[PDB]
Amino acid sequence: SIQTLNLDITKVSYENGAPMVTVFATNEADMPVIGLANLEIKKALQLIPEGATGPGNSANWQGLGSSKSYVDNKNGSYTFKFDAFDSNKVFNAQLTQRFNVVSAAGKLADGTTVPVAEMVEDFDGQGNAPQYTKNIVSHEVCASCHVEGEKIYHQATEVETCISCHTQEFADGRGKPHVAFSHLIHNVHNANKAWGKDNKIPTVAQNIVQDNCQVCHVESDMLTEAKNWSRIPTMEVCSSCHVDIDFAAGKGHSQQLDNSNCIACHNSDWTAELHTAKTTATKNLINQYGIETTSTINTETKAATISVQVVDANGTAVDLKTILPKVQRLEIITNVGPNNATLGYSGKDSIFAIKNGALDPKATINDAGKLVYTTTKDLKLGQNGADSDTAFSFVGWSMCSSEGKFVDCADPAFDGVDVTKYTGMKADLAFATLSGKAPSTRHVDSVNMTACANCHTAEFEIHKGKQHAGFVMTEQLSHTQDANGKAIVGLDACVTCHTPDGTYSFANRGALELKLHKKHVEDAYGLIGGNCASCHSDFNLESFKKKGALNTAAAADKTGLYSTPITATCTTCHTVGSQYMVHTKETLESFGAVVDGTKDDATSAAQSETCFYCHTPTVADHTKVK
Ligand code: HEC
Ligand code: HEC
Ligand code: HEC
Ligand code: HEC
Ligand code: HEC
Ligand code: HEC
Ligand code: HEC
Ligand code: HEC
Ligand code: HEC
Ligand code: HEC
Ligand SMILES: [Ca+2]
Ligand SMILES: [Ca+2]
Ligand SMILES: [Ca+2]
Ligand SMILES: [Ca+2]
Ligand SMILES: [Ca+2]
């Protein structure tokens, strides 16, 4: 019923001794919410300033108590009192005061569902606006990866709440420096030491965050202490990833008995630059060059000719001969039928037109300076309906590089394993038709690269390594816009290899409709759970009408097994015969499905599934049935 619960602390009065704190609660339509039964001041705190506990030391939140004692004022406002405020007798009205207010998800008496809500607000010692703050990060950055509104590890859903409990005082009281939040947060994302009573090595977190400070530390003229990540070096925080130094013993570093001198040597400019230098340099290299690609079909040979034009940052022609010795790889993959690929993985046309500065004999650089290549595999154009009139070609490429500069590829046999020696560049996509009519294109309206980049960054070099140059996905291969006129960067090019017939093995669930789900349900569940909205804005259920069979298994003789397309898509996570699927194979067949059968049988029955008579999935709730 209630979609968003907003909370504001509207009044703080110390006239009776302890503070009386009034909270106003509204819904998404700014209407007052009456009847909250689980509202609480989870923490009352005050701010010991930067350096007060010692030179170079951080500011600290000192505890003043908590309260679940409030009156519902029957107008959207609620007033708290404290039964035992400041039991430690440390209250100081010269300090900034903070209140952390939480409302548990649940149902108002009338049965109205109410979602969780959390907030903090800061004041001076009389309830006016605060004079100074410790605002370094905000909850929004975590939501780029962790599902907004769900608990992050435990206890709460917003970082300010974690920060309000995991304080220096908290850590000191337990004799455990590592549980102070500014140590913990880096610890749990970095694999140099394990964490928890379970000794978990953060392998997955490390591979996503990659120690990149800017995924959480965003400079902003909203958070006045945002630059603290580089301006306040301390042994307590810096040791979270730098785990082998003993400052006390003077091992692996000069002896430092306190934090008095860290900033004198570790100046802010240096700390900020050093931790961000590699990603900054890589992003600079990626944006040095681009490509613009065309494809045409020879109406008589029915082969496709792909032409690639390198351009500079201003989009000005660069003759490929001039940078050829620095091109590490350029690869071109062509399939047919962008809505239901027809050639399979084994039947696709593919070539490394360039490897380590050298042109393949099948590719040439023409007099206008473009690379030109003509397909050699049977593209079977027009052999499978109107969609098969269209060939689509994916171009990926890389340039050799060292320490932020492009360099010559001096080793023709360089295998691409050492990713520090080259940079994947912006990939491209080109369409051509046998008929000469406009090309068909795949829907790109349900998932796009912007969603992938929330976790992997915009500079994600997909598949970079021994097997591929690294595909960087950008507006270069956009062919449509959203309702707002923003270019959509689709993943439709990936279908060149991620075909309905699978990838190199029929046991991989390689089709694109299955592969992203399989990889992420297996390895990203700790982050995403069942949150389809992590990737999807919508489900394009109409797209199923353009699909045929999808490969779902390998037979014992290693031949391919296939399912009708809706069943195939759902069963990636809901394996037939497992505890994750109630419908038996017999029942699914009674709904028109083919389950791990022949390609012919699955193709014939592809538009015979009755699943959507009952199932009405939306991204908000994919489990919905009539
Ligand atoms: C906000 C969403 C968070 C997050 C991300 C974490 N916490 Fe807590 N936490 C609390 C207590 C009493 C402990 C045990 C400490 C001990 O071992 O003595 C923890 C522990 C953790 C861990 C494990 C850290 C480790 O190195 O072992 C982690 C990763 C963690 N928390 C994350 C208590 C609280 C709260 C008290 C009201 C609040 C709020 C939070 N935690 C919030 C969060
Ligand atoms: C105050 C207690 C600190 C803290 C928290 C750190 N330092 Fe230093 N440090 C200095 C030099 C010349 C180096 C080597 C530079 C380099 O490797 O490029 C370091 C190294 C570090 C590290 C990184 C350790 C690593 O090998 O990765 C860290 C995390 C670190 N320091 C923290 C020089 C100085 C000083 C000059 C006399 C002073 C004082 C400090 N550092 C103080 C601190
Ligand atoms: C948008 C549809 C995409 C695409 C194309 C990819 N991702 Fe993710 N990803 C996430 C996590 C936690 C992992 C596992 C990391 C690990 O186990 O070390 C992955 C893995 C991948 C890969 C494998 C290569 C790699 O970098 O590990 C690939 C190719 C890939 N993904 C593509 C996390 C997320 C998200 C967090 C909510 C989001 C969103 C995405 N990924 C989105 C996409
Ligand atoms: C992507 C660049 C992330 C951002 C931004 C934040 N987190 Fe994260 N976190 C991320 C991953 C891939 C993982 C590992 C998940 C897994 O299955 O291993 C984590 C892990 C944590 C943890 C430990 C719990 C765990 O699941 O291992 C915590 C406590 C945590 N993250 C907290 C957290 C906070 C508070 C963030 C905002 C400051 C935050 N993370 C951002 C990826 C990313
Ligand atoms: C999210 C997964 C983070 C990443 C990646 C990095 N930092 Fe961080 N840092 C994060 C949080 C939630 C906090 C606590 C903020 C608070 O209000 O308490 C911090 C804190 C720091 C600090 C302490 C600043 C202070 O005033 O004491 C430092 C020095 C710091 N972080 C440094 C730092 C560096 C150098 C990083 C890249 C290697 C980095 N952080 C990444 C969250 C996250
Ligand atoms: C994990 C999120 C880290 C935190 C917290 C801190 N550092 Fe760091 N540090 C980290 C990485 C991944 C690297 C390698 C950077 C590179 O690309 O070379 C470093 C490196 C340093 C260095 C240079 C050491 C070297 O190998 O040449 C220094 C001097 C350094 N870090 C200092 C430093 C300080 C002062 C920190 C607290 C403010 C700090 N680091 C935190 C990862 C992480
Ligand atoms: C052929 C040149 C490919 C293109 C173009 C793309 N991918 Fe790929 N991918 C390919 C192979 C041979 C494999 C391994 C076999 C398998 O099916 O798993 C993959 C694998 C993936 C995975 C899984 C990764 C894992 O660690 O398990 C993902 C998530 C994936 N591929 C995604 C993906 C995307 C988004 C692409 C377009 C940018 C893409 N692939 C293109 C081969 C090829
Ligand atoms: C990113 C890791 C994703 C998550 C999380 C979820 N889905 Fe997804 N989905 C993803 C991709 C790359 C594709 C292929 C798009 C294409 O061009 O083939 C899909 C596809 C679907 C579909 C097919 C309809 C469509 O919109 O294309 C469905 C019905 C679907 N996905 C459902 C679904 C559900 C129910 C999810 C949460 C449990 C979910 N997806 C998460 C990527 C990702
Ligand atoms: C992984 C990306 C999934 C895809 C693809 C599909 N579903 Fe799903 N589903 C997924 C999860 C993680 C869960 C929660 C499991 C649990 O803990 O209970 C679900 C759940 C459902 C349900 C509710 C289960 C029940 O009580 O019956 C339904 C009805 C459901 N899913 C339907 C469904 C359909 C029709 C799908 C294809 C369009 C589909 N799911 C795909 C994960 C994933
Ligand atoms: C009505 C006669 C249905 C038809 C036709 C199909 N499904 Fe179904 N399904 C139905 C119900 C009532 C449920 C349970 C809902 C709940 O909330 O408990 C389901 C469940 C599923 C699931 C989730 C399974 C699980 O998590 O255990 C999936 C993935 C699913 N159904 C898929 C599916 C397919 C592929 C269908 C067409 C072949 C199909 N369903 C038809 C009701 C009905
Ligand atoms: Ca207020
Ligand atoms: Ca909030
Ligand atoms: Ca760690
Ligand atoms: Ca283009
Ligand atoms: Ca039909």
Residue numbers in the entry: 45 to 670
Sentences from the paper on this structure:
The mtr operon includes the genes to express three proteins: a decaheme cytochrome MtrA that inserts into the periplasmic side of a 28-strand transmembrane β-barrel MtrB9, and an outer membrane decaheme cytochrome MtrC that inserts into the extracellular side of MtrB. The outer membrane cytochromes MtrC, OmcA and MtrF are exported to the extracellular cell surface by the type II secretion system and S. oneidensis ΔomcA-ΔmtrC double mutants are severely compromised for respiratory mineral Fe(III) reduction and electron transfer to anodes in microbial fuel cells. Here we demonstrate a reversible transition of MtrC between cytochrome and flavocytochrome states that is controlled by the redox state of a conserved disulphide.
To confirm the conformation of the CX8C motif we solved the x-ray crystal structure of S. oneidensis MR-1 MtrC. MtrC has substantial structural homology to MtrF, UndA and OmcA with two multi-heme domains flanked by two β-barrel domains and the same staggered deca-heme cross present in all structures. The structure reveals that, with approximate dimensions of 90 Å × 60 Å × 40 Å, MtrC is too large to fit into a 28-strand MtrB barrel and so would likely be mostly exposed on the surface of the cell. Alignment of the MtrC heme iron atoms with the iron atoms of UndA, MtrF and OmcA reveals that the heme arrangement of MtrC has a closer homology to MtrF with an r.m.s.d of 1.7 Å, than to UndA or OmcA with an r.m.s.d. of 2.1 Å. However, in domain III there is a hydrophobic cleft next to heme 7 that contains three phenylalanines, which in the UndA is occupied by an extra heme. In the fumarate reductase of S. oneidensis MR-1 the edge-to-edge distance between the flavin cofactor and the nearest heme group is 7.5 Å, and this distance would place the MtrC flavin binding site approximately halfway between heme 7 and the disulfide bond.
